Amino acid sequence: MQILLANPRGFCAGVDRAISIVENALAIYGAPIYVRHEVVHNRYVVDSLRERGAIFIEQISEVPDGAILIFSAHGVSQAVRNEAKSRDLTVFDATCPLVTKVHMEVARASRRGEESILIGHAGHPEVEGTMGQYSNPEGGMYLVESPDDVWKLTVKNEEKLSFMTQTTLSVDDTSDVIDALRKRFPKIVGPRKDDICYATTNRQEAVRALAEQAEVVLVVGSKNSSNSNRLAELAQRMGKRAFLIDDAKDIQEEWVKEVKCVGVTAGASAPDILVQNVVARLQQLGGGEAIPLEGREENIVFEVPKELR
Numbered sequence: 001m002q003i004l005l006a007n008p009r010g011f012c013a014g015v016d017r018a019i020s021i022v023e024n025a026l027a028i029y030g031a032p033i034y035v036r037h038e039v040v041h042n043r044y045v046v047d048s049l050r051e052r053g054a055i056f057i058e059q060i061s062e063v064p065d066g067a068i069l070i071f072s073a074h075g076v077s078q079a080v081r082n083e084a085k086s087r088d089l090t091v092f093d094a095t096c097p098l099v100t101k102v103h104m105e106v107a108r109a110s111r112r113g114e115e116s117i118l119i120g121h122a123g124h125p126e127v128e129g130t131m132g133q134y135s136n137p138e139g140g141m142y143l144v145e146s147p148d149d150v151w152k153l154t155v156k157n158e159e160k161l162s163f164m165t166q167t168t169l170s171v172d173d174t175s176d177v178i179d180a181l182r183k184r185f186p187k188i189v190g191p192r193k194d195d196i197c198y199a200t201t202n203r204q205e206a207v208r209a210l211a212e213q214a215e216v217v218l219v220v221g222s223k224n225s226s227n228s229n230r231l232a233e234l235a236q237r238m239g240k241r242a243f244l245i246d247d248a249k250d251i252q253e254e255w256v257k258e259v260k261c262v263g264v265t266a267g268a269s270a271p272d273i274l275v276q277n278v279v280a281r282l283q284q285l286g287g288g289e290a291i292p293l294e295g296r297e298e299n300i301v302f303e304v305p306k307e308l309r
């Protein structure tokens with residue numbers, strides 16, 4: 001059985017930065033370091049940091065006075081930031097710079113009292129954080145997930161309306177939402193295409209290329225990782241069996257029995273050691289040397305804040 005690896009796969013710049021922010025905090029200050037939300041949506045990363053003394057919480061009321069608190073890479077609402085600010089807390093922010101870019105646009109619209117529409121998935125932490133930058137009661141902030149949602153939306157003033165997107169969506173499904181937004185609201189203002197980041201765009205392109213060759217695609221990523229779920233979904237819609245897996249223990253032999261070509265990729269929150277162990281397991285199940293596919297080269301790095309070198 002041939003093993004193909006998607007390219008690019010695995011860690012993006014925001015996820016490597018966020019992990020480094022928590023590890024460096026641990027190394028500088030010792031345990032415990034409190035983290036608001038999973039720093040990134042990967043069970044192995046989160047367990048690793050927990051075993052080293054990071055304590056992951058959902059609400060600032062779970063953090064003691066005097067504690068060091070880190071915001072996860074997905075970002076936080078103004079209310080959460082204000083709650084940490086009004087408390088005794090030393091705060092480091094691991095929000096990806098490409099999520100903060102979206103937050104600044106929502107802040108701008110809020111200050112103008114002009115309504116905004118975010119395209120994104122209800123209850124995802126990034127959507128909570130981004131919706132949470134809008135505070136002006138005179139404007140409005142609305143979430144849509146599908147064209148049907150756009151067809152039911154009514155707003156106060158459609159001549160002054162802008163849109164933003166979550167960073168880890170399906171490029172194709174988002175494009176259909178934006179097409180609806182523009183038909184429904186011809187004066188709506190947005191970015192040229194969406195706020196989907198380079199890493200999400202690039203890993204979707206890479207898994208498309210992988211699924212063209214492979215019969216079965218394994219995506220290394222946790223169940224609550226939006227971008228990892230989008231890679232599996234993309235492969236499934238191309239008619240390949242695709243499985244979202246945390247690690248090699250998840251691989252069921254039946255999924256690859258009699259399969260001549262198996263493809264592996266990884267979401268932007270999955271460490272390469274997990275892919276290495278997946279490949280080892282596929283080799284126990286008959287696979288040969290893993291062959292990386294040619295891919296678009298990535299070169300962006302985001303540095304940790306100077307305070308945490």
Ligand SMILES: CC#CCOP(=O)(O)OP(=O)(O)O
Nearest residue numbers: 040041073074225226227269
């Ligand atoms: C912030 C961020 C990021 C990329 O990985 P993730 O943590 O799995 O996040 P998503 O659930 O948004 O995909």
Ligand code: SF4
Nearest residue numbers: 012014096098167197
């Ligand atoms: S998936 Fe994109 S926006 Fe999210 S942390 Fe990675 S680089 Fe930043």
